[PDB]
Amino acid sequence: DAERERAQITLASIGDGVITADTQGGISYLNPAAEQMTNWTLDKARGLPLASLFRIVDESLLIEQILSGEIDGGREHSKLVLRHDGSSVPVTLVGAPIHRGAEITGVVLVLHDMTRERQYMARLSWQATHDALTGLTNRREFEYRLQIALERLERNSGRHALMFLDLDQFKLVNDTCGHAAGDELLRQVCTLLQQGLREGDTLARLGGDEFGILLENCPAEKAVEIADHLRKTIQDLHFTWSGQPFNCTVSVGLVHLLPGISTLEEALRSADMACYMAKEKGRNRVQVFHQDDVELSMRFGEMTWVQRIHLALEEDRFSLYAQPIVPLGEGAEEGLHVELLLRLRDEGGRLVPPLSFIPAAERYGLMTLIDRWVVENAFRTLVERAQDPRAEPIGTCAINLSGATIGDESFLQFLTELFARYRIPPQTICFEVTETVAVANLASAIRFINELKDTGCRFSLDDFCAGMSSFIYLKHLPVDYLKIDGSFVKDMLEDPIDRAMVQVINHIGHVMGKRTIAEFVETVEVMEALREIGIDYAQGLAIGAPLPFSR
Amino acid sequence: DAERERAQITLASIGDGVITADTQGGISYLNPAAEQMTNWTLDKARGLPLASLFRIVDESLLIEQILSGEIDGGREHSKLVLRHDGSSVPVTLVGAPIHRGAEITGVVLVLHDMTRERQYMARLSWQATHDALTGLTNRREFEYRLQIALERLERNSGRHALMFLDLDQFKLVNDTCGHAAGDELLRQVCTLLQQGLREGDTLARLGGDEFGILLENCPAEKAVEIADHLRKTIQDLHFTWSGQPFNCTVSVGLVHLLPGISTLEEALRSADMACYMAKEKGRNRVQVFHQDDVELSMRFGEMTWVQRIHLALEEDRFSLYAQPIVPLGEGAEEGLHVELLLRLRDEGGRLVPPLSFIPAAERYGLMTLIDRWVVENAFRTLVERAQDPRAEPIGTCAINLSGATIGDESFLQFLTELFARYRIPPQTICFEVTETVAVANLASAIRFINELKDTGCRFSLDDFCAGMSSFIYLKHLPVDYLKIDGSFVKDMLEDPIDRAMVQVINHIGHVMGKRTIAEFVETVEVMEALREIGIDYAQGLAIGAPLPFSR
């Protein structure tokens, strides 16, 4: 009837190839995109078997049965459309069975041409100014808007207000529930912050658990009131994952800005200091930046952490633990592989959680000091351990290094002296940097990895996620290993997207010559899923717990 | 009838939101994706006006009239779906009018959720191992396959054959016709090479005009025969652009490999030397790599180009020309901006085309020598020019630098001495590097740009194209200007994708704090289109030709 005309126009408005066929393969429908993809019109193709017109194969018998039984309209399947004349078209395929009520009458195929991706200019433009997960503006667009707000000649009558709000429990949800849970929590916090702001305000996701807010031409008191409202609004959120709730809060840093006097870098640094202060003072609060109040408090904090870290070093209260990393490949003979983990005890002998000292040690530039103690005591422990002729030889000793060590020019001289003093083969050492630390100082990370590899050391890129940016960065980072962020592994057996991310990290890591490591392997079921996938190494509670390493 | 059931299943197999409405906005159809996007089911939404259920607006009256008159099913439009409760969903919109034959009965909207892009793992996996334009394997996947072919234990009985085939006229088509023409020529050469190869062979696009071929377990004679066939097959291609033909040929480099002895880096370097030799010897030929024949010929070539470049320097046969760059912005007062261009004359006084000396000077490491002459004679010319009190002062002198200069540690000392000798303000100098040179040695390009900017010099990133990789690279490259590749500008008034690429480069360049420059602005119509877009500067024959600069 008239339904046909409407359905045709609608399916012609779809950019992807749409193929409808019977159980035998006889072509019932093709939209213009499918026609261009197949090199066959519907007038000529109608009724004829699919396989006698073109082919749909894997990268160099029939796909119909796979659709009606096995594979369905869930995940996309990478295929080639062989035109049996003009070679091929690379596509992602989705297929679903057609029903009459109970009777399987045919099949629908939706084919996306991989080659058309470079033509989506509105999407590319959107992706450069927005966060792919939340849909909010990214750091790039946010800083641009903040710079305009500070330098613009028009609509610059009042004072602006910059906010940094960190979600306090992001890491907790991401590690204990998995990546999918962390993503859902960020999307809900995003909705709630959007709901609490008005048109004219910029809301961004700056990275990880951090959001950015810009209130343009906002009086001082009003800005501080809005911040307190948003903060309390997050406390009122009831986030749950598989029935399990979480108490969500934000630590907020607020800085009042004046267009013409306030600088982009000064603004960002101020909101950062104020946000850190809000966390230092409790975590579920707002901290308004003041020139006297915040600089004195940061100077006080610097003095206290210099004393705290040095006293902990002087009183032999730092220690090293070792967690095993095992190969998942057959007939393994590489020697014990461990990752070293730092631990700190307080004056009473109680273990100090890492978030109680590492963020302060990073903030106050005390990490090169910690890294130097770690590396030296690792070497010192390896020598002592080697006194035992029966001791299981260590083939790999993985050590994590901070951004501050990455940018330190004197580290290589310190390391050369450690090799001469302790006689550890450089080859047995694997230094690790997170993907975040590497990208934050890219040029210095590239030089640092190449210099250390020239010494004979190995390198690992930790907390890695798949993406075009990550794989582009990986092209320039000559690491030996790629360590999958544990949050993907944690729920890979429950989340099909986290399972697919593990598969993608593994496949691409291997294409780029990297060996792959999965962390947070807490069960043998996860371990066997990773082995089926092809991951090289595994680490977690199913492999072995962190054990005392240093004496 | 039964058409409805089929149409529903088909539209439910589409991941994008599908909305069908009447001229008034009354909702006739929603597929499940549209329902999730709008937060409204069809049972509840049917008949009701669109705007009273949700909104579709620009980034913070009606869109129906825009669809039935102005905007259509061509380009995607970035919009926000305001749910009037749970804030929004960022989307790309495509809209087409519905007809009965002549009567406009309604509208179809196809909405792509921008936030779902990070969930396409099969697409991401595909994009990391494939060239987005041709659909062939990329450099990354190709090198991986070549490495496997050389180290594998199984299926490694014979000798493999590696080929590099460069399309001789790619630059010619790309510059004279535009980017869209260059892309179409590569897609046709891709089809033809695919058509000439069998399943088991790897065909890749390695970059620009270069393709890579791997023939595994191929006897020597057969490999050389296949190469000659492919080469002749390209000569038989009849490529045309708007009725205008081009004579297409490939320069081919072939190297026979032995798995277990041949190295990845040695293989790639050999095929490269052989491909360069094929070009040096005529361009429409195959050059089989031989250890004696090619190394002697490259050693002979090195000796001849050392003598040729030094003699040209000694006989004052190199010269500089200057082409103007003008601001497109209102009330301009920045002083004359020029880009310096190298020219070389032969022993008879005739101009030598750049491709007759620059590729050899790059190949044989003679570019730092050329760059040093260029920079010094630019400074020397600026001093001489300044003797005239009436001479138009030069505010910007743009100079292009090679990859070899980027990686030269002594250049900054040479430049410091030039500043002390000629007294040119560093601020008046803008150094340029192509996006290709920068990415080829990323770490050294970052350090080089930062060091030169500390001296007071400006920097420009030339031959720039929009893309996620380009914008990711741009994040780390602290340049002042972004120069749009001329091939996009050349056909922007005829190709809607090249027009959209110019708009995207401009918009993102501005977000990243860069000032934008368009090259190949050959007409005032192109110039005014660029001004409407917001491009900062223009260069080309409509602005002014290259004129003698040095004496």
Automatic annotation (TrEMBL), chains A, B:
One of its GO terms (molecular function) is metal ion binding. One of its GO terms (cellular component) is plasma membrane. The keyword Ribosomal protein does not apply. Residues 3-70 form the PAS domain. It is found in: Cell inner membrane. Keywords: GTP-binding, Membrane, Metal-binding, Nucleotide-binding, Transmembrane, Transmembrane helix. Mg(2+) 2 binds at residues 339, 400, 432, 462. Mg(2+) 1 binds at residues 166-167, 209. Its cofactor is Mg(2+). Coiled coil: none annotated. GO terms for biological process: regulation of DNA-templated transcription; regulation of single-species biofilm formation. Residues 158-291 form the GGDEF domain. Residues 302-551 form the EAL domain. 3',3'-c-di-GMP binds at residues 342-343, 371, 520, 522, 541. GTP binds at residues 169-171, 174, 179, 183, 205, 283. This is EAL domain-containing protein. It comes from Pseudomonas aeruginosa (strain ATCC 15692 / DSM 22644 / CIP 104116 / JCM 14847 / LMG 12228 / 1C / PRS 101 / PAO1). The chain holds residues 241 to 797 of 818 of the full protein.
